[PDB]
Design a protein around this ligand. Structure first.
Ligand SMILES: [Zn+2]
Ligand SMILES: [Zn+2]
Length: 291
């Protein structure tokens, strides 16, 4: 299963389909051969695990993930949960918070999509830009309930690096040990103040939008990583690319998942990070958090 001797990409999508919400086939990331080739490339750079963030109604495909693992040998940790307000199915409003929690618990305990594969994390649970809507609050409470019963960690989605502290306060008010929560997308803006506060509360933070330079530059992500390294806070930071589109794949003229290792990490080491510093974020942290 999980291989603690190798690297872990903390937030990725291997099979996601948000094409129906957008009317864009680019958002239907389901090109098997290409995805398998990308996993083989990751394997050559020491990656052994990928935490998949596609929950049921985001277009998850357990069989596809089982197949990718069978073909490449990479380990994929599947998730369970609900996305964000704009993408919620109608039933998030009509079901009770208890029913939502039960669903997440069964996906963790029995299996997902009719297969033998089980969800290993409650994720990607998100909030909207600059606000937590009533339905998102309900989903976060359900996540808290499912975590309090199964102990599986919670991995979130912050919209443009907003509301992270609010997500933590909500989860903690519902009995969640914040060391079991990792805040996604903290790297889409100058977000040091919030990040330091989140780490102070005991949560893990993620710089998982590496390569998405039209949103925020990698140079600035590197500067923020240095601020964390300077304060001895690297043991709370995890990394990823958050690949979501066909155009992100190398076969389609994109940068691919391994861009993290072929390009970003080399720039990070060039700016001063030791390989040990890198290994804390890519190997140590995930092994301690995801298991
Ligand atoms: Zn996300
Ligand atoms: Zn994502």
């Amino acid at each position: 299963s999980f291989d603690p001797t190798g690297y872990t990409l903390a937030h990725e999508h291997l099979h996601i389909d948000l094409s129906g919400f957008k009317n864009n086939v680019d958002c239907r990331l389901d090109q098997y051969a290409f995805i398998c080739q990308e996993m083989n490339d990751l394997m050559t750079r020491g990656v052994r695990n990928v935490i998949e963030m596609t929950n049921r109604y985001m277009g998850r495909n357990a069989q596809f993930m089982l197949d990718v693992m069978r073909e490449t040998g990479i380990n994929v940790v599947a998730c369970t949960g609900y996305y964000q307000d704009a993408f919620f199915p109608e039933h998030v409003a009509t079901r009770s918070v208890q029913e939502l929690a039960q669903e997440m618990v069964d996906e963790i305990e029995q299996g997902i999509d009719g297969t033998e594969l089980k969800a290993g994390i409650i994720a990607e649970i998100g909030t909207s830009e600059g606000k937590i809507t009533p339905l998102e609050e309900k989903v976060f409470i359900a996540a808290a309930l499912a975590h309090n019963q199964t102990g599986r960690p919670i991995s979130t989605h912050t919209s443009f690096s907003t509301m992270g502290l609010e997500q933590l306060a909500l989860l903690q008010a519902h009995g969640v040990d914040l060391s079991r929560v990792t805040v996604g997308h903290c790297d889409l803006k100058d977000n040091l103040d919030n990040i330091l506060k989140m780490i102070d509360l005991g949560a893990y933070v993620q710089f998982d939008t590496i390569g998405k330079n039209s949103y925020y530059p990698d140079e600035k992500r590197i500067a923020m990583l240095h601020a964390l390294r300077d304060r001895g806070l690297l043991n709370r930071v995890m990394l990823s690319m958050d690949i979501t589109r066909r155009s992100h794949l190398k076969a389609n003229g994109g940068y691919g998942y391994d861009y993290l290792l072929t390009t970003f990490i080399p720039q990070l080491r060039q700016s001063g990070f030791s390989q040990a510093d890198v290994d804390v974020m890519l190997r140590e942290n995930p092994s301690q958090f995801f298991q």
